[PDB]
């Protein structure tokens, strides 16, 4: 029924780009490392 | 108050201008929003 035919489950979080499936929304502001788009970046950082 | 844009690249949901999306044109909306330029 999807042309994808992967399968991804994981942390939800909706933007105004669209919907980030795979990364976890924290509170925090860092600089930008991967660009998304309005407002939200990417990166992978420890905790 | 005086630019009128078009899509401003957010989510779409008697038919507007923003039919082109079902022919495959999509319009992205920027890194920097409006808050940030401010
Ligand atoms: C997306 O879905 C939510 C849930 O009903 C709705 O409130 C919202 O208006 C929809 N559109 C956008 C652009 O978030």
């Given amino acids: 029924p999807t042309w ?4 991804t489950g994981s942390n939800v979080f909706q933007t105004r780009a669209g919907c980030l499936i795979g ?3 924290v509170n925090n502001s860092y600089e ?3 660009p998304i788009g309005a407002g939200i970046c ?4 420890t905790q | 108050n005086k630019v009128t844009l078009a899509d401003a690249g957010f989510i ?3 038919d507007l201008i ?3 999306k ?3 044109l999509t319009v992205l909306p920027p890194l920097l929003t409006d808050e940030m330029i401010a």
């Fill in chain 1, 4 to 7: 994808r035919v992967y399968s």
């Fill in chain 1, 23 to 25: 990364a976890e929304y």
């Fill in chain 1, 32 to 34: 930008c490392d991967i």
């Fill in chain 1, 42 to 45: 990417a990166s992978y950082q």
């Fill in chain 2, 12 to 14: 779409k949901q008697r």
């Fill in chain 2, 18 to 20: 923003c039919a082109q």
């Fill in chain 2, 22 to 24: 079902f022919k495959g």
